[PDB]
Amino acid sequence: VLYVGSKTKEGVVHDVTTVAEKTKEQVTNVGGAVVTGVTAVAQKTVEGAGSIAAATGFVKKDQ
């Protein structure tokens, strides 16, 4: 691997705006998962079998 004057952006996240208003949120959960917020993952490598890279709102009931 050789980079020579090579401006690079390997695996990034940027410029992520969010606006809400008057969001009268009622939420009720029982045993489950709820995700309502901004999430920003940025990885270069996730190696290994059985991996779970960057889940969100995940539920796992493996027997």
Shortest spacing between CB 5 and a second copy, in angstroms? 5
Q: Annotated binding residue at 31?
A: no
Shortest spacing between CB 41 and a second copy, in angstroms? 5
* CA dist., res. 34 & res. 37, Å (int): 9
Nearest to 45, CA basis, from 54, 35, 37: 54
Contact string (CB under 8 A) for a second copy, positions 7-46, x = contact: xxxxxxxxxxxxxxxxxxxxxxxxxxxxxxxxxxxxxxxx
Q: Is residue 48 a contact partner of residue 19, using CB atoms and an 8 Å limit?
A: no
DSSP 8-class letter at 50: T
- Annotated binding residues for Cu cation, written as ranges, equal 14
Q: Which residues contact a second copy by CB under 8 A?
A: 1-63
